[PDB]
A paper describes a structure:
The 70 KDa ribosomal S6 kinases (S6K) RPS6KB1 ([name]) and RPS6KB2 (S6K2) are key effectors of PI3K/mTOR-regulated signalling, and have been implicated in a variety of human diseases including diabetes and cancer. In order to generate a more robust crystal system suitable for the generation of high-resolution protein-ligand structural data required to facilitate S6K inhibitor design, we decided to develop a [name] chimeric protein based on the catalytic subunit of the closely related AGC kinase [name]α ([name]). Our [name]-[name] chimera was created by mutation of five residues in or near the ATP-binding site (F54Y, M120L, V123L, L173M and Q181K) that differ between the two kinases. Co-crystals of purified [name]-[name] chimera with [name] inhibitor peptide (PKI, residues 5-24) were successfully grown, routinely diffracted to between 1.5 and 2.0 Å resolution, and ternary complexes with inhibitors could easily be obtained using soaking experiments.
Analogous to [name] and other [name]-based chimeric proteins, the [name]-[name] chimera could be expressed in E. coli and the tetra-phosphorylated enzyme purified using a protocol described previously.
Numbering used by the authors:
A (entry chain A): 13 to 350
B (entry chain I): 5 to 22
The structure:
């Protein structure tokens, strides 16, 4: 089928799920706790084993009261509502979701290959064909998400999981939002923020295209285009209107990056009349077979060493904390639809 | 080098959302 045929069926499938969301599809007692894979103000991610199947999953655990304090109620309801409705080869799948008196749970597929982040930092940088292979997956993923009126808002190597075939899967929809107009929330990660977000303007899906420019630059250089010790210093560099490229960057790469890391919204690739085709048809992607990437037929440039479905060697060690469940229901109204 | 400057910086680990 054509891109349009695929996207039309994709919207019909998404809308049915968006309008009648899946809710309470599992319970905590159906999982065995293995190890904490990640922890921060946004919550924890726990490796769990589902007893009925023996499958491993990454369980995102959110403390309802902490979500309220962080003013993330609407963002959390967005994340779960969007995740249960989407279906794309390069998105981490939401397998189950449920809540109890104290916490919200999102059970996701577990990719022991880990985040692109760890591999990128250790290796140092990815050669242009290697960075291109990942970038092609993100372009197709944003074409899919944006067609559903979804803005992602947190692209970075930390949110890109590497599967057993070396393909990537976008995870963490904490700031994803279904919006047809412009939006104003100050959110994302400092290095990846478009100038319009820093400048407190109303913004749209073009921020995701800017973030793609940052990602490609970081993948190919080994460091982001705008970095400093503190976020305030990063913002100054982003708004200054200046970017420097490593001497090893190809002429085509630099040209694509000037078009993505473009302050002028009437000129930024992805935003314009021709949309995503301005990116797909760029000289840097001349060797890219978009259909073969989608069909997962392209040989991956890197396959993480496979050490078992429950292996955690690609994740750091975190302090193991209890999963406390109060005897009293917390935040009943705020999360009734979760 | 830009690489040496990045490596000596405090933002080489996983980055938190704002």
């Amino acid at each position: 089928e054509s891109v349009k045929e695929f996207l039309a069926k994709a919207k019909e499938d998404f809308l049915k799920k968006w309008e009648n969301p899946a809710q309470n599809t599992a319970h905590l007692d159906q999982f065995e706790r293995i190890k904490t894979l990640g922890t921060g103000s946004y919550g924890r991610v726990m490796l769990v084993k589902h007893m009925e199947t023996g499958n491993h999953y990454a369980m995102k655990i959110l403390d309802k009261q902490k979500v309220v304090k962080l003013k993330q109620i609407e963002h959390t309801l967005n994340e779960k509502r969007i995740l249960q409705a989407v279906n794309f080869p390069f998105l981490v799948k939401l397998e189950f979701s449920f809540k109890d008196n104290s916490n919200l749970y999102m059970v996701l597929e577990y990719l022991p290959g880990g985040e692109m982040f760890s591999h990128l930092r250790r290796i140092g940088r990815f050669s242009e064909p290697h960075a291109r292979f990942y970038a092609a997956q993100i372009v197709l993923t944003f074409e899919y998400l944006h067609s559903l009126d979804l803005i992602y808002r947190d692209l970075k190597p930390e949110n890109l999981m590497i599967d057993q075939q070396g393909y990537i899967k976008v995870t963490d929809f904490g700031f994803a939002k279904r919006v047809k107009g412009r939006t104003w929330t100050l959110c994302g990660t400092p290095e990846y923020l478009a100038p319009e977000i820093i400048l407190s303007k109303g913004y749209n899906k073009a921020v995701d295209w800017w973030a793609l420019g940052v990602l490609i630059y970081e993948m190919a250089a080994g460091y982001p285009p705008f970095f400093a010790d503190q976020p305030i210093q990063i913002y100054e560099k982003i708004v200054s209107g200046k970017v420097r490229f490593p001497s090893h960057f190809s002429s085509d790469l630099k040209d694509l990056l000037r078009n993505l890391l473009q302050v002028d919204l009437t000129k930024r690739f992805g935003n314009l009349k021709n949309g995503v085709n301005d990116i797909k048809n760029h000289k840097w992607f001349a060797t890219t077979d978009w259909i073969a990437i989608y069909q997962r037929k392209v040989e991956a440039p890197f396959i993480p060493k496979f050490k078992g479905p429950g292996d955690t060697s690609n994740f750091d060690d975190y302090e193991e904390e209890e999963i406390r469940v109060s005897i009293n229901e917390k935040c009943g109204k705020e999360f009734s639809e979760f | 080098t830009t690489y040496a400057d990045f490596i000596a910086s405090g933002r080489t680990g996983r980055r938190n959302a704002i």
